[PDB]
Amino acid sequence: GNAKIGHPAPNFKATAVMPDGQFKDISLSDYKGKYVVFFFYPLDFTFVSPTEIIAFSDRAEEFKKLNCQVIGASVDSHFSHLAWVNTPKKQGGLGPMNIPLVSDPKRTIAQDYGVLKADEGISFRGLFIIDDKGILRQITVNDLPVGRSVDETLRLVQAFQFTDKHGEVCPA
Amino acid sequence: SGNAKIGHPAPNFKATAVMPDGQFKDISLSDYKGKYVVFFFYPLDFTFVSPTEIIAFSDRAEEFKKLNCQVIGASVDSHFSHLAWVNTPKKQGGLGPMNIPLVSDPKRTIAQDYGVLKADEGISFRGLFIIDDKGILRQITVNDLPVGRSVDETLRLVQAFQFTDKHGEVC
Ligand SMILES: *C1=C2C(=CC(=O)C(O)=C2C)[C@]2(C)CC[C@@]3(C)[C@@H]4C[C@](C)(C(=O)O)CC[C@]4(C)CC[C@]3(C)C2=C1
Ligand SMILES: *C1=C2C(=CC(=O)C(O)=C2C)[C@]2(C)CC[C@@]3(C)[C@@H]4C[C@](C)(C(=O)O)CC[C@]4(C)CC[C@]3(C)C2=C1
């Protein structure tokens, strides 16, 4: 792929299901000026991914206080994403979302980020931290069965922002 | 770039390491088949953020041993540089005695194989890799230089891969 630490994160333009439940075409570059956590999950209607997606959505306000946009993505269609959102939470659905979910049906976004599992056409569990100038700061890739931690992601986002700011702090 | 791919054999290496007993030894990743491995890079010796990470992994090595997991650190510095840093007491800014081996990658080929060499600076990013007991790469972590890693998160990951190893085995 083309995701390199210290280089601009690969842009994308893709259809996402938005928190209001409608579809919108969004780009990574829409979020310049804010940190971005961009994470891939393999497929909709699976059993590890919902724990992660719901945790990032549930805790979205902790990312907003860090001026950080969270974006999820999978190769499944945006229609499939919405179907999972609309499945009742008590029956296994995602329920209402506080984060957008991108659809990568051509697999080009997962390829650009180096996380496509080529022999199956789905993404590994890749997570990327992109700073407010668009520069990639952190790469995380898990094999399919093992989920990610919102606590760890918050730790990293905050730590990068602190080290970003150290040199402009008042010298008193 | 690099040859580290999830679900494929982790790139092998053979390199001089400073072992916990203070001796040099040429070791290979394949020496540790039968154990999980946490293999982590740091940019260079005698720095500020890196010793806190290295000491944290060394101090907590028993928690990895209980998971049948070997921890190995690495940088492009010479094996003499590693040994001098170990022989510098922690209270004077050194590493002090270590419970983990520290690999020397002076030709930068290990960092290149793992995709973590920072071009034109000749140092590695803060890369960390989790390799299972069959030598297969399960997890990739790469931090830009300013931000360190968490032993807690690394243990959570090792535990989680070992958990999922307990179902779905075909052979
Ligand atoms: C941080 C602060 C400063 C004052 C201050 O009241 C304050 O609240 C904060 C947080 C000082 C000490 C004030 C003076 C400057 C800003 C100077 C002066 C300079 C001409 C300016 O006014 O912008 C240029 C910047 C410079 C040299 C650095 C910061 C600070 C020393 C300063 C930072
Ligand atoms: C599991 C598998 C094996 C191959 C394989 O392609 C595969 O998909 C799975 C799930 C191997 C590596 C194949 C060879 C055997 C089956 C051997 C050979 C043996 C003669 C047989 O054919 O059954 C006897 C069993 C033996 C020695 C152990 C398993 C495996 C090494 C194997 C398991």
Author numbering:
A (entry chain B): 4 to 175
B (entry chain A): 3 to 173
Question: Could you share sentences copied from the article?
Answer:
Peroxiredoxins scavenge ROS via their peroxidase activity, reducing hydrogen peroxide and a wide range of organic hydroperoxides. PRDX1 is a crucial antioxidant protein to regulate oxidative stress. Then peroxiredoxin 1 (PRDX1) was identified as the ROS-manipulating target protein of Celastrol in colorectal cancer. To obtain homogeneous oligomeric and less flexible proteins for crystallization, the Cys-52 and Cys-83 residues were mutated to serine, and the C-tail of PRDX1 (176-199 aa) was truncated.
To reveal the stereospecific conjugation and binding mode of Celastrol, the crystal structure of PRDX1 in complex with Celastrol was solved to the resolution of 1.76 Å. Then it was found that two PRDX1C52SC83S,1-175aa monomers formed a head-to-tail homodimer, and two Celastrol molecules were covalently linked to the Cys-173 residues of the homodimer. Moreover, the 2Fo-Fc electron density map contoured to 1.0σ for Celastrol linked to the Cys-173 residues confirms that Celastrol is a covalent inhibitor of PRDX1. For each PRDX1C52SC83S,1-175aa homodimer, the covalently linked two Celastrol molecules stretched into and formed non-covalent interactions with adjacent homodimers. Interestingly, the binding modes of two Celastrol molecules with adjacent PRDX1 homodimers are different. For one Celastrol molecule, direct and water-bridged hydrogen bonds were observed with the Trp-87, Asn-89, Gln-94 residues of adjacent PRDX1 homodimer. While for another Celastrol molecule, direct and water-bridged hydrogen bonds were observed with the Arg-140, Thr-166, His-169 residues of another adjacent PRDX1 homodimer. For one Celastrol molecule, hydrophobic contacts were formed with the Phe-48 and Val-172 residues, while for another Celastrol molecule, less hydrophobic contacts were observed. The covalent binding residue (Cys-173) and non-covalent binding residues are from different PRDX1 homodimers. It is known that PRDX1 homodimers form into decamers in its catalytic cycle, then this unique binding mode of Celastrol with PRDX1 homodimers is likely to disrupt the decamer formation of PRDX1 homodimers.
